[model samples]
Target: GSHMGDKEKETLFKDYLNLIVVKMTEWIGNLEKAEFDVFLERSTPPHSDSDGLLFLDGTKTCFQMFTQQVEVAAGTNQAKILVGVVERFSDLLTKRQKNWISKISEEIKKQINYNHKYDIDPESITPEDECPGGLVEYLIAVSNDQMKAADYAVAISSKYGKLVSKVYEKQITNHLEGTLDGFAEVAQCSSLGLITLMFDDLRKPYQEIFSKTWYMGSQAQQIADTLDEYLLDIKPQMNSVLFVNFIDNVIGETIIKFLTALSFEHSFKNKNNKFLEAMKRDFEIFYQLFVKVLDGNESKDTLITQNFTVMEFFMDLSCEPIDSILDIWQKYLEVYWDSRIDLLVGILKCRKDVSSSERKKIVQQATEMLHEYRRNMEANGVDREPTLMRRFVLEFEKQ
Candidate 1:
C-alpha cells in the first residue's frame, strides 16, 4: 500500500489481487465438483485441455488465463504481493487436488481388476498373453482420449512450476506416490514388456537384465531405446510439461530397478564377467537418452549425470576384490543403515565370481553386521524398511 503511495492506487492493487485470485480459485472449485460428479464422462480429452470444456480442461484454461496475470504481477516489482499470490495458489490448488487424487487411484485399480486379464502375474508369460492395449488403455482404460486422465494430475503440478513450482511439485509427487506405485507394480510384473523383449533377443547364447556380459550385444542401450520408444509413444498424448518430470522419475526408477536386478542373489556363475565396460555402455546410452528426454538443460543434465555417475562408482565396487568390497562396506557403507543394504547385498550376492560359495560366509557375515547395525539402531531408537532382510535372508535362514 505504502509502496503504491496513492490510496486509490493501493486499493486497486489490493482489489486486483483479491479478485483475480478469487476468480482462479472459483474456477478450480467448480472443476473439483465437476471432477467428482462425472470426470470420467467428461475426461474424453480431445488431446489438450483446449477443447474438453470441463474438469481438467476448465482448470487448464483457467490456469493458462490466470498465469498471464501472474506474469504481469511478477514483472512489476510487486514482490511481496506476488509471493502471497503464489502461496495462495499453491495452497488452494493442493486442496482442490484432493478432489481427484483418490478418484484416479481407485479408478485405475478397478480398471486393472476389470481387465483382470491385466491383473497379469507374469510368472510364466506366453505369446497368447499379448499386451492387451497401449499403455494408457491398460493404465487408465480411456480408449479415445488424447490426454489420459493421469496427465491431468501431472499438468497441474507442471503449470504451477512457473509459479509455486517447488511447493506444488513436491505436493504433486507426494500425492501421486501411491498412485504411481500402483502403476509401477503392474508394469514391473510384465517384465516391463520391453525388458523381456530385450532379454529374449540378446542374440548371445542367453540374455538377462543383469548378466556377466555387458556389451557383447546391445543389451542395455536397447533397453534404453525401448524406454525412449515408450516415452515417445506417449509424448503426444499427454501434457508436454508432464513428460519433462516424467522422464526424471523414469531415469531414477530405471536405474534402481536395473541395479536391483543385478543385485539378485547369485545372478551369475563365472560367465562373461568383466562388467564395467558393459556398465559404461549402458550408462552412456542412458546418459544420451537422458539428454534427449530432458532437452539437456545444464542443471538438469548435471543432476542426472551425477546420479548415474554415483551409481558408476558404487557399481564399480561390485567388480573389485570381494574383501575390498567388505572393506568399503565397513569403511563407508556399514556406518550408515537403511535400504542401501538392499541394493549392496543384492549386487554382491550375485557376484560369487568374488564371493564364491563363501556366498554363505559373506551372507552370514553380513547378517552378523546387520545384527550389530540393528542393535545400534535400536539403541538409537531407529527402524527402517525390512525389505532387504525379508527378500534375501528370510528363506535362507529357514534352513
Candidate 2:
C-alpha cells in the first residue's frame, strides 16, 4: 500500500498526532484558569488528594488569580469570577498536590535541559528504564540515538507529549459551575441528572471557548486585551524567584545543554530569542494542522489550516542560522515533533460544539495571516523582527 505520496502521507499523519499536543496545551490553560478561578475561589484546599483535586499546584496558578483580579479585571466582563476562579484553583493545587514543590523542580529541570548536553549518572535520569510503552517509549527510543549535543532536545520533546496527556482529560466545570453557578440551571431543570446533562452541554461554549473566535476580528482583540490587562497588572509583583532560580540557575544551566548553547546565539534578528518567537508561531500552525487532520469530522469543516506546507516554514527557519545554529534548530525541531500532541491539546479544549467548518475557518485565517507575516519578515530583511507575535502563536499556543 505504499504510495507515491508516502512522504505527504507521513506528513499528514504526523500532523494528525500534533493536534493532541495542542489539545493538551489548551487543557493546561483551562486547568490553570480553573485552578485560579473555580477551585481556589471555592476555598478548596491546594493539597487535596481527592479525585476532585489534582494538577492544581504551581506559581502560574497564583499569577493567574492575582493578575486577572487586580490588574486585568477591566478586560473581561466576568473578571471578578475569573479572578476568583484563579485563586481558588491555585489554592487547591498548593494544598492537595504536595508534590508542587518537587513537580516545580521537574518543570524547571525540563525547561533548563531544553537546549544542551548535560552529564549525569543514569540514576539522575528519572525513569532510567524505558517509558512504559507507546508514544512515550517511542519518543525515548528516538532520543536514545541522538548524539551528545542532542540530549536535551529529546527530553523537551517528551515533556511536550507528556503534558498533552496529563492536561487533556483534566476537567474543572464540575467545581467551577457547581460553586459559581449555584446550579441555577439545576434548579430549573426537571431532574437533577438531566439538569447535569444539559448543563454539561451548555458549558461547552459557556465562555466562547474552542471556537475560532479567538483568531481575528473582535475575538482576537478581546483575547489580547484580556491577557494584556491580566498579566501586565501582576507583572511587577509576580515574582520570578522560584521559577527563575530553578529554571535559570539550576535546570537551565544543567539540563537543556544543547539549547543553552544556542541561547548564547540569541541576539537581535539572528538571536536565539528571535528563533523562539518565530518557532512559536510555526508551532501554532503545526498545532492547527494536527488538530484538524486528526479530528476527522472536524477536518472536514475547518476554515483555516497551516497544513499547506510546514516544511516551507522549516526551510525559512533554516535560513538565519549558521552551521552551529542549524544543528540547534534541528535539535529543537525534534522537540517540536515530540510536542505535537501537547500542542493539539490546546485546540481540543475549545467547546466541542464548534462546528468543524467554523473551527476550520478560524484556523485557516489564523495560519494564513501568520504565513503572510513570516513571508513579509523574510521579504523585509529587517534588522530586527517585530516583537509582537501574531494571533495564532500568541493567542493559541498555550491558551
Candidate 3:
C-alpha cells in the first residue's frame, strides 16, 4: 500500500485537472448520495430486531481492518503509480507510435487466472471474508474505485474531466474545422447538421477506452492503445487546427457575408416575432463576438499560443450586443467544458491508462501558456483581466 496520506502525497499541481477534479467531485457526491440511499433502502431487511442489519463482532473486526487497508491504499503511492503509468502510455503514444492492439497487449491484456469458479484454498476463505487475500484485495479495490463514484472529489471531479476530454476530441476529430471546410467546398451554411456528422467520428474511439480494459492498473495501457488507435482513426477525421486556414480562405469570411445578406433580405419584412427575435439576436451576437475576438482590448499576451482558448472565445460573446443570449452562452459553456472533461476520462479512465503525472504534464504546458499571457499583460501595463475564460471553462472557481 502507498505508505503516506494525501498531505505527504506529492500533489503535483495540474492547474486545469485539479480544477476539473474539484468540480466533478461535487457532481459525484450528488450522484453517490442518491446511490447510497437506494442501496440502504434495498439492503434493509424486514426483521423484528431492526437496528439496521448489524454485523457480528467477527464481521465488524474484519470490516475495520479492510477499511483501514483501503484508506491507506487510497493515498499518494497509488497516485504516483497512476502518474508513472500515464507517462508510459504517453511515451507509447507520442514516441513509440505503437498500435492500439499492441499497446494493449504490452500495457494490459495480461492473463488472469481465468478460474472464476475457483477451488478456494482453506486458508484463503476466512469466515469474515474481508481480507480476501492479496490478489482479491487489489482486484476489489481497483474495481470498486472504477465503479464507485470515486471519493467525493473524484466523483465530482469527473465532470470537469469531461471538459478536458472535449478539447482532446476537438483537436483530434477536428469537428468545427471539418464542417467549415465541407461548407466551403459545397458553398453552403455549415449548420448544426454538419457539426453532428463531424462529431460522430469521436464516439467510437471514446467507447474503445471503456470496453476491454479499464482500471487503475490498466489505465496507462488502455490510454496508449487508445492513442495508437485514435491516431489511426484520426487520420480520416481531418482534425480542425489544420483546417483553420481553409476556413479562413472561404467559409469563415463567407458566414459573415451570408448573415449580412440575410439581414438585408429581412430588412423590410414584418417577420414572425420569434423568428425575428431569434435571427436578430443570433446574428448580432455572432457578429459582435466574432469582431470582439478579432479586435478586442485583449492585451498582447492574451492571444493563445498553438491553439485558441475556446472558453475565452465563448466569453468574448459577452462583449457582443445580444440580449438573452445567456441561454446559448450557458449551453456553450456546458458543452465546451464537459467536452474537455469527457476527453480526460476517455484518455485516463481506460485500461492501461497513462500516469497522472503524464496527464499533468500535458496540462502543465497549457498552464505555462496561460502564464505567458499573464506575463504579456503585465508587460503591456494592462490592468489584470480576471481569469474568466480559462478558469470558468475549467471550473477552477469550484476548487
Candidate 4:
C-alpha cells in the first residue's frame, strides 16, 4: 500500500505530537505508579524493522525532535511549530517528579501507531471489533490528575470529543429521565416544593460536580447538540406540570459551580483586595464558559427567562405585601452584592428569550432597589452621592 506524502505525514505526526505532549504534561504534573507502568511498557521506541501496526513511542522522542527543530531554524516558520510544543512543558515540569522518566519513555512508545488510520491506506482504516479502551485509560488519567482536574478535562474533551458527547448524553438523560418519576409528587405542590425537589432530586449532577473533581464546562462544549436534544425531550414533561423552572434552577446552579471551579485556578481564593481585583478582570473567562454551556439552541435562553418570571411570581405570592418583597430584595442585594448583580446581568444580557418589556421591568426593579438604598443611606447621615452603591446604581440604570 502507498504511504501519505511527507507533508501529510508530518502534519499528522505533529498533531499526534501535540496531543501526546499535552497528555505527558498532565502525567508529569501528577505521576502515578499504574500509569507510569503503562507508559514504560508502551513508549519505548520501536526498531525500524518492526512490522506491526502499533508503532508510536508516546512523547519522549517528540520533545527531543522539537528541541532540535527549534535550534536549527530559530527564525523560520517551521521552528514556530516546535516552539509551541514545549513552551508549556517547563512550567509543567517544575511540579514534576524526577523518577517519572521511565513513564515518559513508555508514553512515547504508546503514542506511535503504524496502524493509525493516517499511517495506513484509507481502505485499511477499519473500525474496532470492540469499543476502544482509550476512554477507560483516559478516565484513569483523569482520576490521577485530581488537582488539575479541569486541565485533564480539557485534554480529554479535545482528544475524545465524540466520546465525551456520548458519555454526557447518557449521564444527563439517565439523571433527567429517572427524576421524572419523582416529578409526579411535586407537580400539584407549590413552587417551594418544586424548588426543593429540583435541588434534592433533579439536580444530582450539579451537586455531584462539587463533591468530585470534574469539569462541566469542558464536557459541555462537546455535548451541546446532545444537551439541546435532551432539553427538548424534557421540555414537554416540564411544561406539563409547569416545572420548567426546574431546568432554570439546575442550569443556574451548574453555571455557578462551573464558575466557582474556574475561579479556584486564579488568586480568587485570597481575601486581599488586590487578589479580588485580579479575579474580577478574569470574569470574561466565565462569560466564555457560559457561552459554551449555552450553545446549540435558543431554548436555553427561553427556559432561563421562563424561570426568572416564575421566580418573581413565587416570591410575590410567598410574601404578604409588596413592601416585604422589596425588603427581601434589598437584603439580597446587600448580602450578594456583585455576585447577585452578575447572575442577574448574565441572564438578562445572554438570553435573547427575554422580551423588551420584561427587560425594562427587571431594570425598574433594580432602580427602585437602589433608590430605596440611597434613601436609607441619607437617613443614616451617610453621604449617599459619593457611595459605591450610587455609582453601581447609575451603571445598573444605564444598562
RMSD (CA, angstroms), candidate 2: 28.9
Off by over 4 Å in 3: 1-193, 207-375, 381-397
Task: Indicate the residue-level lDDT of 6 in model 2.
Answer: 72
Per-residue lDDT tens digits of candidate 1, residues 1-399?
Answer: 255558877777788778777876777777667644544443343233453221234345545654666566666555445654555665665554454445545544433443444445565445444433333422222211213333443554455444544654465445433243333333232223323232323323223555544445666666676677765655444444434444545665556555555433535433464456556667788787877766644456644763564465456557777767666555433423543445455565566565445655665666566667767888989766432113222112211
lDDT of 3 by residue, 133-205 (tens): 2221122112222212112223222422333345443332232122222223221221212222222333333
Candidate 2 or 4, higher lDDT? 4
Top candidate when judged by TM-score against the true structure? 1
In terms of TM-score, how similar is model 4 to the real structure? 0.23
| Model 2: lDDT to the true structure | 0.30
Global lDDT of each model?
A: 0.50, 0.30, 0.29, 0.37
TM-score of each: 0.49, 0.18, 0.17, 0.23
Regions more than 4 Å wrong, model 4? 1-143, 146-323, 340-362, 367-399
Q: What lDDT tens digits, residue by residue, belong to model 4 across residues 326-380?
A: 4555655553333233334323432234456665666578657766765676688
State model 3's lDDT. Answer: 0.29
* Candidate closest to the true structure, highest lDDT: 1
Backbone clash numbers for all candidates listed: 3, 71, 44, 16
Task: Give candidate 4's whole-model lDDT.
Answer: 0.37
